[PDB]
Coordinates of C-alpha atoms and ligand atoms in Angstrom, one line a residue:
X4 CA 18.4 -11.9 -32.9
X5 CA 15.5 -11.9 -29.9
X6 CA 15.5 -9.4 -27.1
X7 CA 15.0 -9.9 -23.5
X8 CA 13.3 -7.8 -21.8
X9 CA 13.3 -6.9 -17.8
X10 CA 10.4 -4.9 -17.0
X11 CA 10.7 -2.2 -14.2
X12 CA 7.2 -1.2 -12.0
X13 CA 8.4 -1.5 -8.7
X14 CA 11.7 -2.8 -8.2
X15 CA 13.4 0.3 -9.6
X16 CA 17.1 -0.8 -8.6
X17 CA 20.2 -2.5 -9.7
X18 CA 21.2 -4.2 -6.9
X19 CA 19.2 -7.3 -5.3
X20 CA 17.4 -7.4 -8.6
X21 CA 16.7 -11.4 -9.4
X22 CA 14.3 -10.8 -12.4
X23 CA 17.7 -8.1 -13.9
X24 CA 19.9 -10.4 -13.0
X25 CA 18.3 -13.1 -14.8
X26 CA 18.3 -11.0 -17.6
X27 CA 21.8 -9.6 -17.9
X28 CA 23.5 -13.4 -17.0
X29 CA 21.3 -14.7 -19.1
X30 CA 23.2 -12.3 -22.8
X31 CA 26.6 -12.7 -21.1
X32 CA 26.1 -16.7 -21.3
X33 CA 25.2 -16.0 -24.8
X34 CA 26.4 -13.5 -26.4
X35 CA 26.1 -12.2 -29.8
X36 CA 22.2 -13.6 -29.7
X37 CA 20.3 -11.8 -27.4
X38 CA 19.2 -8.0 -27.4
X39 CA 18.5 -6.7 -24.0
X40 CA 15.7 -4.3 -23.2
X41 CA 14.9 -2.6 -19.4
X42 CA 12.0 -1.1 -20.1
X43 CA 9.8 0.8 -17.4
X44 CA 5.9 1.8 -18.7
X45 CA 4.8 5.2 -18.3
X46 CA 1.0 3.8 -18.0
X47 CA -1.2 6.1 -17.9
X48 CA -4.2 3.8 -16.6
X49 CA -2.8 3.9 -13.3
X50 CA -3.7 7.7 -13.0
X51 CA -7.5 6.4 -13.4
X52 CA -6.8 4.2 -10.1
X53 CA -4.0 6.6 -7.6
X54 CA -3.3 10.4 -7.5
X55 CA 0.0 11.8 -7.5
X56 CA 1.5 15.0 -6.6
X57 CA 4.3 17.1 -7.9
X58 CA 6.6 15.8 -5.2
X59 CA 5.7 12.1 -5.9
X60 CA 6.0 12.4 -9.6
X61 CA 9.4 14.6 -9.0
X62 CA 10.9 11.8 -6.8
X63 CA 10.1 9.1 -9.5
X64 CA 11.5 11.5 -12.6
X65 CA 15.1 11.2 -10.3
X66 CA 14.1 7.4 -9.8
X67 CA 14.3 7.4 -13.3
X68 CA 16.8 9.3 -14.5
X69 CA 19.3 7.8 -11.9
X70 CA 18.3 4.1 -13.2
X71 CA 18.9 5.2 -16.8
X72 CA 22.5 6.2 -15.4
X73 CA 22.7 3.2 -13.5
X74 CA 22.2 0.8 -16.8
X75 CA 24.1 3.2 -18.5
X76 CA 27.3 1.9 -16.8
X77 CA 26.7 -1.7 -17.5
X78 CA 26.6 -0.8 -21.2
X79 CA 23.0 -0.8 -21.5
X80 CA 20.4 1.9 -20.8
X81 CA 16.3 2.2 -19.6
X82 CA 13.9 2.7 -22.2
X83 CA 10.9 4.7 -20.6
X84 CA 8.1 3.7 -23.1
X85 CA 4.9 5.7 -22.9
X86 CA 1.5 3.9 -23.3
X87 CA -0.8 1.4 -22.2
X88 CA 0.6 -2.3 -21.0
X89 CA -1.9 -3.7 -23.1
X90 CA -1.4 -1.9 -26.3
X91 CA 2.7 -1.9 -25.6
X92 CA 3.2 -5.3 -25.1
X93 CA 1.6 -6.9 -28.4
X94 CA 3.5 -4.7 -30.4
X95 CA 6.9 -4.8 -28.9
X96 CA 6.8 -8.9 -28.4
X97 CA 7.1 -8.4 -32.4
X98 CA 8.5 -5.5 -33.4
X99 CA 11.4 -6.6 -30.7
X100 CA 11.2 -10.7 -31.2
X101 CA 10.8 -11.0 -27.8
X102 CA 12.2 -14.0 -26.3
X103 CA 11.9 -13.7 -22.4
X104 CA 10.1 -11.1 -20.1
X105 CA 11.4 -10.5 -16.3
X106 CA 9.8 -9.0 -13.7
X107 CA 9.1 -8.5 -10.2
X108 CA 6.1 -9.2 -8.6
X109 CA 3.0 -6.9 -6.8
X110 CA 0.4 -7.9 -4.3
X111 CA -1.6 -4.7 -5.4
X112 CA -5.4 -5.6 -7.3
X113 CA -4.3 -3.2 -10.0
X114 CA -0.8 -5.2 -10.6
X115 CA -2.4 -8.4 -10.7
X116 CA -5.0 -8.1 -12.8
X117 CA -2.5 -6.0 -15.4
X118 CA -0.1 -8.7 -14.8
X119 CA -2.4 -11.7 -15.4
X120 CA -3.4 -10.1 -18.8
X121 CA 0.4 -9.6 -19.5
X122 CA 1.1 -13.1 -19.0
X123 CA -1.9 -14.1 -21.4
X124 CA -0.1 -12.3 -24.1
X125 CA 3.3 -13.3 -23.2
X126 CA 1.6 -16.9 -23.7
X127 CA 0.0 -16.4 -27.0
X128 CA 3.6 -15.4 -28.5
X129 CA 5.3 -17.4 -26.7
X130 CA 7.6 -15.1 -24.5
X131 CA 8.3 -17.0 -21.6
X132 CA 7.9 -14.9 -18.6
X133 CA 9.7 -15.0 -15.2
X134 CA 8.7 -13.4 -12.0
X135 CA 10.3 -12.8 -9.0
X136 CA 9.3 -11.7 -5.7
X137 CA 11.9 -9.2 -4.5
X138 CA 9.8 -6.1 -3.3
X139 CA 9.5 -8.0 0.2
X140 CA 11.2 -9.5 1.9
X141 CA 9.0 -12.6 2.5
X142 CA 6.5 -13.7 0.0
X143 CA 2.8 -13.4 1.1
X144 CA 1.6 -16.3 -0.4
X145 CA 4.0 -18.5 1.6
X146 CA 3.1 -16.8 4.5
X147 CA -0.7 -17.4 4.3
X148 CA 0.0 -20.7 3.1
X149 CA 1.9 -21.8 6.1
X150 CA -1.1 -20.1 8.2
X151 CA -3.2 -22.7 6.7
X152 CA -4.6 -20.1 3.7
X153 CA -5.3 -16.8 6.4
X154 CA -3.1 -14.1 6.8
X155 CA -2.2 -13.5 10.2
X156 CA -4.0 -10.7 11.6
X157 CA -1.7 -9.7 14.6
X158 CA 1.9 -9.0 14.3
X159 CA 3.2 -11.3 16.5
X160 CA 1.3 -14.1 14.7
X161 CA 2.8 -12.9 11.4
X162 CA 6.4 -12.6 13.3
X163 CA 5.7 -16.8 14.7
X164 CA 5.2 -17.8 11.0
X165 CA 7.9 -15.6 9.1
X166 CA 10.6 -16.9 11.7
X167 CA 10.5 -20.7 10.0
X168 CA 10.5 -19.1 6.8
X169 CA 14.0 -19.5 4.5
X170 CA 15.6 -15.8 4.6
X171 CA 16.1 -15.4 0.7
X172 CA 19.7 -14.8 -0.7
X173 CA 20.7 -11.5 -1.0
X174 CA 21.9 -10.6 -5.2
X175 CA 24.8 -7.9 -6.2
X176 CA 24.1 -5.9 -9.1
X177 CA 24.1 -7.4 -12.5
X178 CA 27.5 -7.9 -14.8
X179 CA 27.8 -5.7 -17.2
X180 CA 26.9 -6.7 -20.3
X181 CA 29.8 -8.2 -22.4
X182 CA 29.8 -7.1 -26.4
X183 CA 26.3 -5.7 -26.9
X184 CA 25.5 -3.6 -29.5
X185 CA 22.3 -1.1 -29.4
X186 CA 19.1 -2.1 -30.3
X187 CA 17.8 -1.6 -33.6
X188 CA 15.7 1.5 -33.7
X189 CA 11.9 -0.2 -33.8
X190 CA 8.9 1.7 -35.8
X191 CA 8.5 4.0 -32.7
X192 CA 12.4 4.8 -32.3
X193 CA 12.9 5.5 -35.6
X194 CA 10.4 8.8 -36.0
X195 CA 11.5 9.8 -32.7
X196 CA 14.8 9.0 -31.4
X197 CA 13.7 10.4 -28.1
X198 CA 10.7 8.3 -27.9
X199 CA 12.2 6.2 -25.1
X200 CA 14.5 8.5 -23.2
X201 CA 13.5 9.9 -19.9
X202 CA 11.3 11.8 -19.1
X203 CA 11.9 15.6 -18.3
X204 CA 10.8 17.2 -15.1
X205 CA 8.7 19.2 -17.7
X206 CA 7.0 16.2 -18.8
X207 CA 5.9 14.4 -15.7
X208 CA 5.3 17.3 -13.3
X209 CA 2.6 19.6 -14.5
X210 CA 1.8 21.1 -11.4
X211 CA 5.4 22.7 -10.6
X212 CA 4.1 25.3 -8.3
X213 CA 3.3 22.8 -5.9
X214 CA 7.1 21.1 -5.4
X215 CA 7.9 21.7 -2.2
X216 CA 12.0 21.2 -1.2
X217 CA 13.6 18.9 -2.9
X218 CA 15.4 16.8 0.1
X219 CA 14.9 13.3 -0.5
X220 CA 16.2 13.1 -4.0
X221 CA 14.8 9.5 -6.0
X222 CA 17.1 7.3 -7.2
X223 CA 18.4 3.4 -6.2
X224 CA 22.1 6.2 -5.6
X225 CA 20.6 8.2 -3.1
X226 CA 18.8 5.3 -1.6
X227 CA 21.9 3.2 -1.0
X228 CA 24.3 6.3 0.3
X229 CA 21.3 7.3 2.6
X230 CA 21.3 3.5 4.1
X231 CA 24.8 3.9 4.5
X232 CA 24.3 7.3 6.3
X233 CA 21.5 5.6 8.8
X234 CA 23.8 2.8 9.2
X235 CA 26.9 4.6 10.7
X236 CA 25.8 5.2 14.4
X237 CA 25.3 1.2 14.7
X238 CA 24.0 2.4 18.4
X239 CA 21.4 4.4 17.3
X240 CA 20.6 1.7 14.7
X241 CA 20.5 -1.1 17.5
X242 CA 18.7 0.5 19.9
X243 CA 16.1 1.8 17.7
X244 CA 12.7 2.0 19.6
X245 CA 10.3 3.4 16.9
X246 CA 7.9 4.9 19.8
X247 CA 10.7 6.6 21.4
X248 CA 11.3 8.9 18.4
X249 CA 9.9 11.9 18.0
X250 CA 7.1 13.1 15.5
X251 CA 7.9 17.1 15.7
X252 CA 11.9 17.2 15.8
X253 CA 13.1 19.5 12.7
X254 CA 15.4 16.8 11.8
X255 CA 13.8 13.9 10.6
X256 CA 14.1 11.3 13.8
X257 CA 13.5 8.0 11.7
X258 CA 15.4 6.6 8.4
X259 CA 13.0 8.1 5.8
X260 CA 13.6 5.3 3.8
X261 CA 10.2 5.2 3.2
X262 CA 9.7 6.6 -0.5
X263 CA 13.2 4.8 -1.4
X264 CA 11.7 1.0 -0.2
X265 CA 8.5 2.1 -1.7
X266 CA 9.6 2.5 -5.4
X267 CA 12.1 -0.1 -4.5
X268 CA 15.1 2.3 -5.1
X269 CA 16.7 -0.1 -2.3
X270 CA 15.6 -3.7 -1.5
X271 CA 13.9 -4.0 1.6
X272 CA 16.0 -7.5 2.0
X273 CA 19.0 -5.9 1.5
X274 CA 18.0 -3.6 4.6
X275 CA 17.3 -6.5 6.9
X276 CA 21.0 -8.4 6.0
X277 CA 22.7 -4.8 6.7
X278 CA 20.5 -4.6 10.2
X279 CA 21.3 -8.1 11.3
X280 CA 25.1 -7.7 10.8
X281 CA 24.8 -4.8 13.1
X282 CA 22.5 -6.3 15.7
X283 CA 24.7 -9.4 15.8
X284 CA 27.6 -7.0 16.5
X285 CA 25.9 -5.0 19.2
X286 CA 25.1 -7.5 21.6
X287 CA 22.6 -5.0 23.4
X288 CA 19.7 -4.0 21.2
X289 CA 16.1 -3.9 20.8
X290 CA 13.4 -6.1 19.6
X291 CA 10.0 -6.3 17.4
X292 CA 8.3 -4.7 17.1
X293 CA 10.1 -1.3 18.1
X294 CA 13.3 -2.3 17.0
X295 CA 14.4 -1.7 13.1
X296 CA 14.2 -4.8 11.9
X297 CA 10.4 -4.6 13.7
X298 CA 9.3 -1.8 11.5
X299 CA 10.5 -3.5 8.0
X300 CA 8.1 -6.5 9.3
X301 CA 5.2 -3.8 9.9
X302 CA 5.8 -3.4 6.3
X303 CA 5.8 -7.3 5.3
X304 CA 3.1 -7.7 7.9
X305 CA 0.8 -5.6 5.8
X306 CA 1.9 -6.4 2.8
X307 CA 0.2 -9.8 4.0
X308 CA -3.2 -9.1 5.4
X309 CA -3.2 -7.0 1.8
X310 CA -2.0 -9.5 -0.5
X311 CA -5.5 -11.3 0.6
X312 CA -7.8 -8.9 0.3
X313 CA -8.2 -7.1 -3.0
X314 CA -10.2 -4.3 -1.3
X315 CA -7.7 -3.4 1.5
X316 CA -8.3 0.1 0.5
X317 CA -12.0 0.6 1.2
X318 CA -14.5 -0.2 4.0
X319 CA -16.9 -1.6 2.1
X320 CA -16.6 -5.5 1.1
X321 CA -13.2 -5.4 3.2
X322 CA -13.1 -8.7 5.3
X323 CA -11.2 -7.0 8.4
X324 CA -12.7 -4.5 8.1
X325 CA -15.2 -2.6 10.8
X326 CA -17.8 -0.9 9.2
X327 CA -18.2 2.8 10.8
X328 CA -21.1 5.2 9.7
X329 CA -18.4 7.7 8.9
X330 CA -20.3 11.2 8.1
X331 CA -19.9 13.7 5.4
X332 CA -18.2 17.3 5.8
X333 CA -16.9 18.2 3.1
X334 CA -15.8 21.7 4.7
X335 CA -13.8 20.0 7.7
X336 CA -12.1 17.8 5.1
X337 CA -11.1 20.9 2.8
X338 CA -9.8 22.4 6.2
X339 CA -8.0 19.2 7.7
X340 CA -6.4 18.4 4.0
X341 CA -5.1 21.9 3.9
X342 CA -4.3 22.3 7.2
X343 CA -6.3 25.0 8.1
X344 CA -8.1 23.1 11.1
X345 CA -6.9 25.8 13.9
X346 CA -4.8 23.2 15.7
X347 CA -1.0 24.4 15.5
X348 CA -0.2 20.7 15.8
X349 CA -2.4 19.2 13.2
X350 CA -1.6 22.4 11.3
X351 CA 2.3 21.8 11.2
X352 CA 2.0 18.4 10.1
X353 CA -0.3 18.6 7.5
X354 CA 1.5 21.7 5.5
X355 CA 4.6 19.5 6.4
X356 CA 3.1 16.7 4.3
X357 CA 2.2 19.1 1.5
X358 CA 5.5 20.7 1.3
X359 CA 7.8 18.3 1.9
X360 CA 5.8 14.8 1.5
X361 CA 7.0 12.7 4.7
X362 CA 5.7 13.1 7.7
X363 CA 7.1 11.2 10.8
X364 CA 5.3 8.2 11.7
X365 CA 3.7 9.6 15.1
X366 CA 2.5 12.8 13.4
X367 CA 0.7 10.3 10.9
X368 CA -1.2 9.0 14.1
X369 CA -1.6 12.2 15.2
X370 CA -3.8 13.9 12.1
X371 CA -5.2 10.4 11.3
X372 CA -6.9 10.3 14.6
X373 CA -7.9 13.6 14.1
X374 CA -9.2 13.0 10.7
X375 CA -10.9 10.0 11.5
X376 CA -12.1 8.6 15.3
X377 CA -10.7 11.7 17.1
X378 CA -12.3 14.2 15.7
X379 CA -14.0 14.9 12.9
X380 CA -15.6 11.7 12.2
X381 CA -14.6 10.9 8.9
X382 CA -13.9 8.2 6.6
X383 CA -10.0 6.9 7.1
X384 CA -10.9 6.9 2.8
X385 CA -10.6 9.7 2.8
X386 CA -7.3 10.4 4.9
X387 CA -6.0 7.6 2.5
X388 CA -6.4 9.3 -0.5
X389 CA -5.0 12.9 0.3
X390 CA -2.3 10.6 1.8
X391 CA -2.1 8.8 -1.3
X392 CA -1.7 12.6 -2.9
X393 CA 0.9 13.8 -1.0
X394 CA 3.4 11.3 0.2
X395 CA 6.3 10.7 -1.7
X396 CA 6.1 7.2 0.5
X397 CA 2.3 6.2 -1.0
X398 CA 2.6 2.7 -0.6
X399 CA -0.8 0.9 -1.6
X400 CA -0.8 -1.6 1.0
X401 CA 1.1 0.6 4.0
X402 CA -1.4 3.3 3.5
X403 CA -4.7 1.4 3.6
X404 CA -3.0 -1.0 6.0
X405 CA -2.4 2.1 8.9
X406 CA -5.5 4.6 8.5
X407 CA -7.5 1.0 9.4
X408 CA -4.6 1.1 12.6
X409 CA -5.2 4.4 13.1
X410 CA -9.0 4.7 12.8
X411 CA -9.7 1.4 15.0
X412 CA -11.2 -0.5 11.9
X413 CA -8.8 -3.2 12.2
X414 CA -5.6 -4.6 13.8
X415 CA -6.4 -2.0 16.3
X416 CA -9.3 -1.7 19.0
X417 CA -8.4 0.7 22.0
X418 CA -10.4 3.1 20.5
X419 CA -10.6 4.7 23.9
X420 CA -7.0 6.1 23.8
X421 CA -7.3 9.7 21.5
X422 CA -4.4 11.5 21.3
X423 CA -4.8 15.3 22.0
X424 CA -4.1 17.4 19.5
X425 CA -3.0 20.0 21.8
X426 CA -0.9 17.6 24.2
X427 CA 0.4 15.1 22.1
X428 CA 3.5 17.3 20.4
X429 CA 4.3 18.9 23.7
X430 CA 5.9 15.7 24.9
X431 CA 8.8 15.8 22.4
X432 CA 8.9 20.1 21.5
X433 CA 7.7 22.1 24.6
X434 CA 9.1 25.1 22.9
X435 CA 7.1 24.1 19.8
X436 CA 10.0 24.9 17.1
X437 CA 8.1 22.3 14.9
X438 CA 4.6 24.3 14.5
X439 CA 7.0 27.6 14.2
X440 CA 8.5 26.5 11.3
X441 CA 5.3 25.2 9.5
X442 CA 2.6 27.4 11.0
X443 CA 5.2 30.7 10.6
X444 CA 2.0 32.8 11.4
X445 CA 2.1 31.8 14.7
X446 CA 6.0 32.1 15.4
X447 CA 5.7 35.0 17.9
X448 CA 3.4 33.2 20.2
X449 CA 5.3 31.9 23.4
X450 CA 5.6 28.3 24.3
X451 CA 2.9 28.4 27.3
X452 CA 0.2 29.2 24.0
X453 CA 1.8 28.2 21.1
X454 CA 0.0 24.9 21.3
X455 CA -3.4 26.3 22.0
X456 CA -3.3 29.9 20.2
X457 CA -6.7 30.6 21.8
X458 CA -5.8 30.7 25.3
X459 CA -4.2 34.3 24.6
X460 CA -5.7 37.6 24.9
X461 CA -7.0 39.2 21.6
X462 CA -4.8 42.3 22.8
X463 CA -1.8 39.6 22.8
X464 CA -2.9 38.4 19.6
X465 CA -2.4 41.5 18.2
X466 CA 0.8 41.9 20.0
X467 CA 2.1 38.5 17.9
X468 CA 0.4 39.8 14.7
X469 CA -2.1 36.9 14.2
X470 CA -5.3 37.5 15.1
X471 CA -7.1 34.2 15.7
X472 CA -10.0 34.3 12.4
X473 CA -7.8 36.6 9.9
X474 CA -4.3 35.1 10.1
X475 CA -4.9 31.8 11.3
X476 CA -8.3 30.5 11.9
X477 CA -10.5 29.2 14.8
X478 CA -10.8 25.7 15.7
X479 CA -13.4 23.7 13.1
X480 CA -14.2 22.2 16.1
X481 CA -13.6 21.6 20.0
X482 CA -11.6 18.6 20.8
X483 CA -12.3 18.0 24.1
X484 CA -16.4 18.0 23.0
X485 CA -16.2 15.7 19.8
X486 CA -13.4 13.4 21.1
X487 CA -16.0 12.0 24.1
X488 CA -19.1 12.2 21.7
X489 CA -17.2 10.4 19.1
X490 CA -15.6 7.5 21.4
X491 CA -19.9 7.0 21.8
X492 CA -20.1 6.5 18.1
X493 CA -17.6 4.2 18.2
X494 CA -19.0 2.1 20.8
X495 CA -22.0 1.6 18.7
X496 CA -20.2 1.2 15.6
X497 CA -18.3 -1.9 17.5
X498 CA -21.8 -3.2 18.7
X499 CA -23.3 -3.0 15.5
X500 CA -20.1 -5.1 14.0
X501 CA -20.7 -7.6 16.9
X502 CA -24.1 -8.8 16.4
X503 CA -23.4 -9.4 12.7
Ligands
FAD629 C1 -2.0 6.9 8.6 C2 -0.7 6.2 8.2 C3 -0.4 6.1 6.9 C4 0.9 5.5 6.5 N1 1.1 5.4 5.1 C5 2.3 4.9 4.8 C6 2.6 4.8 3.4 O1 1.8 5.2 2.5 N2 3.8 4.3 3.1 C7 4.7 3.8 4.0 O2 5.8 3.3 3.6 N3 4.4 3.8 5.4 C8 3.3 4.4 5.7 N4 2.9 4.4 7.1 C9 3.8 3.8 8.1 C10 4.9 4.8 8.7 O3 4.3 6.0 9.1 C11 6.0 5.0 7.7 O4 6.4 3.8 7.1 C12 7.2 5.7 8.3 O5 6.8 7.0 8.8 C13 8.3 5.9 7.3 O6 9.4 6.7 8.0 P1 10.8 6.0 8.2 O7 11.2 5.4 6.9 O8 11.8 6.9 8.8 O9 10.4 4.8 9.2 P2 11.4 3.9 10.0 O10 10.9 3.9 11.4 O11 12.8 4.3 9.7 O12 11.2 2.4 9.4 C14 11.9 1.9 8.3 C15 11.0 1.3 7.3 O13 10.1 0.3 7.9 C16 8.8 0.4 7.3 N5 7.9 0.8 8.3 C17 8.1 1.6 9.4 N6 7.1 1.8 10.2 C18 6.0 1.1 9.5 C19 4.7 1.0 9.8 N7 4.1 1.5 10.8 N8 3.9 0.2 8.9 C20 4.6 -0.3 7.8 N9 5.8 -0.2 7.5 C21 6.5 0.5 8.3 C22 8.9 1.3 6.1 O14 9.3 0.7 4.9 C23 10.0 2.3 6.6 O15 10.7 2.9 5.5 C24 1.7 5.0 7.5 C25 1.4 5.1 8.8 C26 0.2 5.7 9.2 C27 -0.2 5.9 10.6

């Protein structure tokens, strides 16, 4: 008796699952031969190449926990196998007589390089491996290849191709698996047999004093009944203009689906059939790229330009890349990670990032401009990786894809426009109940100051009991100073580019 094998990464769902479906047909069309095995790798490598907070590694412990539950009522179960891919895979190929091996496919450099040496093993033993590519909706490689081998670097080019492309078909979740019995304990199982269950909050988050809420619960469960809840006002969801929400509500004024279609706790393609039965029932509706639909292709619109460059991530040998003499501080970085720059704005978001790990799309822009061409000049790397830290939506390819937006390194070249830091969250919360909640410090300051603490009166700074310096601190710097020296920089920066 051989085991199959479906191997989770991304992909963490049940539903529109190709490479688990495969899989769990594939023992019900021949039963009483095939042991069946969804593993997912605890690899530690990967903490060599990303960071990850407590809220992150939270999120993904649920992930976990509610797949195991998941596979639990379809008579089979995850096994959560700690170690390397390279050292795991040799030795459960045998001690598991490993006929097939499922999975989906990644567009990240670290995924395909660990894949490729994968697959050389799964050839040596003959495992035959199958792959699908379910985390987007369209497959990059198709896409450049029908651009004549270049991804498309505007959005509307990307949008041109995609629409001749063949919408793939939707899958359910698997069948459940008809007279299986439990694997065999293997050499690991039996000395342990915990060795494979899930892990405990305990064991993946060592940093628990720095959970924030827990509000966005992981899980492919939570993910579904949270589209469902999104869905229900089929107004709201067809007349979606992403520019049009706003950054500082209390309430979060998008889908946060994010984290959920990053892990892959719900299929992105999935998403886009549920959003084109309501557009084609609400005969009034928007378009891309404001419109719903228009912000999943932001996602497969990166996930293109990224899938063809294996150093989307840095400046250096990054082919769309403008290359910006972006200067060392360390001390405004310390104070703009922990959001101690002395604008209430950037303040709010950035402790809202820590805390909570999603942050609205807007106030993204917002303290990426100030991190990066606003303001203090530096590298969009380096937004990236506290990003990458703190957002329980890290997404290799979104992240990289947007500080380059943001910073005008690519995709984007206005560089004039700056958003204030001071003016920007007034638009949307003139009473400032956002920077309130997250900057409590400064909750006594009215309205007409709350924005720009500075403008009041040491006596009235007293008089709200924070004292600009001891409570809350001074500006790092002066916007409206930096902003006009730094659109200079850029200027040169773009000259520089152009000659070369
Ligand atoms: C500096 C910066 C960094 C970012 N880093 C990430 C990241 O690491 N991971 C991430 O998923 N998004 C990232 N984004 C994009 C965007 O901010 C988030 O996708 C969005 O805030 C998620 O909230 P939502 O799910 O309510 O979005 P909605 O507006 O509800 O959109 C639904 C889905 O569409 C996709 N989407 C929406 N907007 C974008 C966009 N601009 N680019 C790409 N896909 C998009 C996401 O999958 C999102 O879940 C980043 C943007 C900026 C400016």
């Amino acid at each position: 008796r051989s085991t199959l094998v479906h191997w989770f990464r991304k992909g963490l769902r049940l539903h529109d699952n190709p490479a688990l479906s495969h899989i769990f047909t594939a023992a019900n069309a021949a039963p009483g031969r095939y042991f069946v095995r969804p593993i997912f790798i605890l690899d530690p490598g990967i903490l060599d190449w990303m960071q990850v907070g407590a809220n992150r590694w939270r999120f993904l412990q649920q992930t976990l926990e509610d797949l195991d539950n998941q596979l639990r009522k379809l008579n089979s179960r995850l096994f959560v196998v700690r170690g390397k891919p390279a050292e795991v895979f040799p030795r459960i190929f045998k001690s598991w007589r490993v006929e097939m091996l499922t999975f989906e496919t990644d567009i990240e450099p670290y995924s395909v390089t660990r894949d490729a040496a994968v697959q050389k093993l799964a050839k040596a033993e003959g495992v035959r491996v199958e792959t699908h590519c379910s985390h987007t909706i369209y497959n990059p490689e198709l896409v450049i290849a029908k651009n004549l081998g270049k991804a498309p670097i505007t959005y509307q080019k990307f949008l041109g191709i995609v629409e001749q492309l063949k919408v793939p078909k939707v899958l359910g979740v698997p069948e459940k698996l008809k007279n299986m019995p439990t694997p065999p304990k293997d050499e690991v199982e039996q000395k342990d047999s915990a060795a494979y269950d899930c892990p405990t909050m305990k064991q993946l988050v060592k940093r628990p004093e720095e959970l924030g809420p827990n509000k966005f619960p992981g899980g492919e469960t939570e993910a579904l009944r949270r589209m469902e809840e999104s869905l229900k006002d089929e107004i709201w969801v067809a007349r979606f203009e992403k520019p049009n929400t706003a950054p500082n509500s209390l309430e979060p004024s998008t889908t946060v689906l994010s984290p959920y279609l990053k892990f892959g706790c719900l299929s992105a393609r999935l998403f886009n059939q549920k959003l084109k039965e309501i557009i084609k029932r609400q005969p009034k509706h928007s378009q891309p790229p404001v419109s719903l639909i228009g912000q999943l292709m932001w996602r497969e619109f990166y996930y293109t330009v990224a899938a063809a460059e294996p150093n989307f991530d840095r400046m250096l040998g990054n082919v769309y890349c403008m290359q910006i003499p972006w200067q060392e501080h360390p001390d405004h970085l310390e104070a703009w990670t922990h959001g101690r720059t002395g604008y209430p704005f950037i303040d709010a978001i950035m402790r809202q990032l820590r805390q909570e790990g999603w942050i609205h799309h807007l106030a993204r822009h917002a303290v990426a401009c100030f991190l990066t061409r606003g303001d203090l000049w530096i590298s969009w790397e380096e937004g990236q990786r506290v990003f990458e830290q703190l957002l329980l939506d890290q997404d290799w390819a979104l992240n990289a894809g947007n500080w380059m937006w943001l910073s005008a390194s690519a995709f984007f070249h206005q560089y004039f426009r700056v958003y204030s830091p001071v003016a920007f969250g007034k638009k949307t919360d003139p009473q400032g109940h956002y920077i309130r909640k997250y900057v409590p410090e400064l909750s006594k300051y009215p309205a007409g100051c709350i924005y720009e603490p500075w403008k009041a009166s040491l006596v009235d700074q007293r008089a709200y009991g924070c004292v600009l310096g001891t409570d809350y601190p001074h500006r790092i710097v002066k916007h409206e100073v930096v902003h006009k020296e730094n659109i200079k920089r850029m200027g040169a920066a773009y000259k520089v580019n152009r000659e070369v």
